[PDB]
């Protein structure tokens with residue numbers, strides 16, 4: 065469980081993401097694909113994109129980044145009370161996309177990297193801690209729902 069303080073830190077930095085959701089979403093996906101190129105295969109959509117520049121020009125990648133962050137944002141704003149938001153996400157990701165928990169770790173690392181790159185002044189150790197805990201909670205809960213659905217990823 066996070067403390068109220070911890071949630072406030074998460075949501076304060078998240079308000080900065082919300083100033084430019086698309087641009088944050090692009091940076092996060094590109095960082096994920098750069099750092100762990102195997103994930104780009106579990107994205108048949110724009111898995112063909114060959115340079116950083118093509119990635120930044122892709123309207124389809126940009127739109128997806130907004131869809132990912134909007135869903136994560138809605139989850140974080142529930143401060144742990146996220147069953148109704150998380151269940152459908154687990155369903156899709158376990159049964160259709162087949163995304164292992166390790167890939168949720170990879171994108172969590174990308175989120176943290178981009179938040180610190182863009183907002184160092186609102187993303188010091190205490191804020192990093194808090195966001196790390198929120199993303200851990202998300203992954204723990206999603207993994208439990210994966211298992212319920214019969215997916216051990």
Ligand code: HEM
Nearest residue numbers: 103106107109131132135136153156157161163167168171
């Ligand atoms: C913070 C983590 C994540 C969030 C919040 C998230 C959210 C979403 C959302 C909302 C959708 C569209 C609705 C749905 O199909 O569920 C989506 C689709 C998808 N996600 Fe994720 N996702 C996350 C992580 C990942 C990772 C790490 C991968 C692959 C490495 C992945 C692969 C996909 C794919 C393949 C689709 C289908 C897209 C399409 O065909 O248009 N997701 N995700």
